[PDB]
Ligand SMILES: *[C@@H]1O[C@H](CO)[C@@H](O[C@@H]2O[C@H](CO)[C@@H](O)[C@H](O)[C@H]2NC(C)=O)[C@H](O)[C@H]1NC(C)=O
Ligand SMILES: *[C@@H]1O[C@H](CO)[C@@H](O[C@@H]2O[C@H](CO)[C@@H](O)[C@H](O)[C@H]2NC(C)=O)[C@H](O)[C@H]1NC(C)=O
Ligand SMILES: *[C@@H]1O[C@H](CO)[C@@H](O)[C@H](O)[C@H]1NC(C)=O
Ligand SMILES: *[C@@H]1O[C@H](CO)[C@@H](O)[C@H](O)[C@H]1NC(C)=O
Ligand SMILES: *[C@@H]1O[C@H](CO)[C@@H](O)[C@H](O)[C@H]1NC(C)=O
Ligand SMILES: *[C@@H]1O[C@H](CO)[C@@H](O)[C@H](O)[C@H]1NC(C)=O
Ligand SMILES: *[C@@H]1O[C@H](CO)[C@@H](O)[C@H](O)[C@H]1NC(C)=O
Ligand SMILES: *[C@@H]1O[C@H](CO)[C@@H](O)[C@H](O)[C@H]1NC(C)=O
């Protein structure tokens with residue numbers, strides 16, 4: 164009843180958090196959903212001697228993800244599983260201190276993303292299959308089939324090297340590409356420190372939620388941090404004075420958390436725009452920009 | 462939309478669908494209504510428990526998103542009702558790839574597409590003393606000892622107001638000399654009369670620019686009429 | 696000739712424009728009329744500018760609405776607090792009210808700062824798009840319209856800008872058998888630009904983004920190496936233009 168006199172603070176915080184939650188799905192849609200059709204590979208897998216079995220989807224897995232995608236998903240430890248609990252496992256109370264249920268009891272919840280990992284893998288599979296089977300044409304219009312040797316010759320002719328350099332060295336170039344994919348596998352299976360850019364995305368939200376839980380133990384100058392204790396031990400006249408401090412302190416902590424979430428959402432939106440630009444200009448075509456997509460000639 | 466219908470689906474977030482008949486108004490709840498919870502229109506999603514929408518296996522495009530690949534719409538699937546479905550990613554295609562076959566286009570088309578980008582927003586200013594207290598000398602005297610907070614918010618809003626004009630100048634003022642078109646309008650058979658300026662209007666704007674200015678329901682953002690209409694009683 | 700050089704920038708030779716100029720002009724006029732009809736009918740394309748106006752109006756209305764809140768005081772009316780309470784209790788309620796209103800105004804200032812940063816990023820993107828698509832031609836994929844970019848036209852808008860990106864899109868396709876190179880006399884002939892095509896009877900050479908078959912001669916092909924190395928090379932005769940003029 165006393166919180167109703169403080170105005171539209173809760174409604175504007177909820178509006179900002181709803182805007183951030185819509186913006187995350189907009190970022191994911193903008194990055195991944197760039198092709199209007201779901202292309203797929205032919206059953207034969209002879210792409211001019213190049214081996215694409217590590218990045219093509221594996222049907223043996225329950226979710227159609229490739230070997231490298233499975234390696235990345237195993238490398239990232241996703242600790243922010245909010246609605247996987249579904250509050251039944253939180254209602255069954257355990258003596259172990261579970262961090263997701265403890266913050267779930269405090270009003271802090273995590274909404275699931277709109278696009279699941281299966282749909283993201285289907286988007287990446289369609290993009291990679293269209294890239295392999297058609298080149299740059301499916302980013303400009305209908306996909307046009309072309310042999311992969313002719314496509315590699317045309318990619319070399321883009322960077323100023325004639326086609327006979329490929330057509331007299333195609334087996335060597337395929338061997339180098341397969342060895343590079345194998346070295347990518349050997350690097351990702353051992354060096355787990357490369358995915359810190361996503362591990363920090365997990366940790367910056369987990370630490371913020373843990374801090375927001377830890378702010379309740381602060382007294383903010385009151386006699387206690389338990390409002391039932393204050394109401395049971397004081398009259399209403401000085402109890403309102405004691406409880407106004409707690410209400411103002413917790414509201415300021417919530418506003419601080421919302422402001423930091425807004426700044427982090429701005430940074431994440433900038434990174435998502437960069438990722439969408441990189442996808443459109445390097446997956447859907449060849450880039451002449453120096454060091455935009457890898458050191459060397461793209 | 463309320464113009465379309467008044468049928469409503471209710472989603473309980475983070476709640477198992479077995480716990481929702483327990484969370485019915487036989488025991489008291491925060492909302493008074495419970496009449497949705499009785500019925501056969503109960504579906505379970507990773508977002509929670511959806512009530513009032515029948516699940517349909519036919520995947521369409523996402524109309525109203527819910528979560529974890531579930532969307533909902535208002536369709537004639539029965540006679541109108543709210544339906545819930547898995548979202549469709551697009552039409553499935555298979556490129557007829559072979560190592561001796563190529564497809565080369567024999568024709569083209571010219572497509573002119575439209576892209577809209579915001580440039581500047583509204584420049585605002587706040588009178589700190591009159592907003593905080595308002596025609597009150599004692600409250601102004603009490604506000605004077607609180608600090609230079611009003612000065613630093615004035616500084617921040619002035620920086621924003623300068624930055625808006627900087628953005629507009631940087632976007633538009635990229636040409637050294639104001640060029641003008643010749644009176645002859647034969648640009649190789651291309652019709653540019655819908656984007657070239659029309660001198661009939663008092664402001665030399667094109668038909669498409671007039672359409673954009675009509676379509677954007679802009680507020681005042683200026684055009685104050687110098688305090689006269691606000692001072693006049695209305 | 697300006698549009699011919701725009702076509703020559705994207706890998707299509709200018710004879711295509713000089714033989715299809717009336718058709719391309721008619722297609723451009725039809726697309727302009729379609730944009731006119733779409734902007735006359737649908738008003739949901741300007742949602743970004745409309746959301747800018749709605750965000751500013753909503754923030755100002757929220758800042759106006761924050762004055763009626765009590766913030767724990769006995770009343771939101773400062774003159775009523777003056778006329779009812781004594782000096783020290785009145786100063787307590789004024790301290791509560793000024794703290795609440797100052798916190799609301801700081802929240803408004805912070806939200807305006809974040810929104811101004813987002814608007815500045817969008818304005819920098821718009822300036823880059825104007826400088827690289829109106830003042831020139833863009834080779835960046837999907838930066839200015841889907842397809843191959845030709846031109847762009849700027850249009851003003853309330854609190855923003857509108858770009859009309861003109862693009863070239865290939866439309867009607869046809870299957871063709873292809874080969875990387877050609878054996879003529881043991882030499883390996885490679886095309887200079889274009890694709891070696893056939894239907895099964897005769898071998899021609901085309902360009903990539905348009906179908907235009909030409910006789911495979913030594914003017915548009917170059918010799919590199921021999922036939923033993925290239926995988927998938929077919930045998931075919933290569934025409935020599937010098938021999939009939941020598942025999943004439
Ligand atoms: C392409 O690469 C794959 C993977 O390197 C090869 O498939 C086999 O993959 C398993 C792992 O799942 C390895 O242990 C085997 O050594 C791989 N080879 C064989 C013969 O089983 C696949 O053979 C490669 N194909 C080509 C044409 O190079
Ligand atoms: C390439 O596409 C254009 C546009 O579809 C074709 O132009 C059309 O030709 C038919 C011929 O019967 C006319 O009826 C249409 O009115 C034309 N459309 C326009 C926009 O003028 C063109 O014929 C196609 N093929 C060629 C030869 O380029
Ligand atoms: C809901 O509860 C039932 C019974 O306890 C269980 O079988 C089901 O898996 C649960 N679903 C979710 C999403 O938690
Ligand atoms: C959807 O499919 C499942 C299994 O194929 C079936 O049991 C169910 O009745 C279907 N629902 C509709 C609405 O067709
Ligand atoms: C083309 O692909 C088929 C299918 O794998 C393969 O058998 C054949 O050797 C390839 N090359 C040619 C020149 O047909
Ligand atoms: C100021 O007031 C006069 C009084 O009629 C009016 O005519 C004039 O237009 C006003 N100035 C402006 C800028 O509107
Ligand atoms: C090329 O051939 C494939 C298979 O024969 C067919 O599916 C495809 O439609 C053909 N393309 C055209 C443009 O006819
Ligand atoms: C297609 O086949 C016909 C057979 O009559 C031939 O005259 C023509 O040159 C061929 N065209 C191409 C592009 O191979």
Ligand SMILES: *[C@@H]1O[C@H](CO)[C@@H](O)[C@H](O)[C@H]1NC(C)=O
Nearest residue numbers: 878881922927928929930931
């Ligand atoms: C015809 O082309 C094939 C393709 O490799 C080649 O093996 C053969 O030697 C050629 N014919 C002659 C007479 O050289």
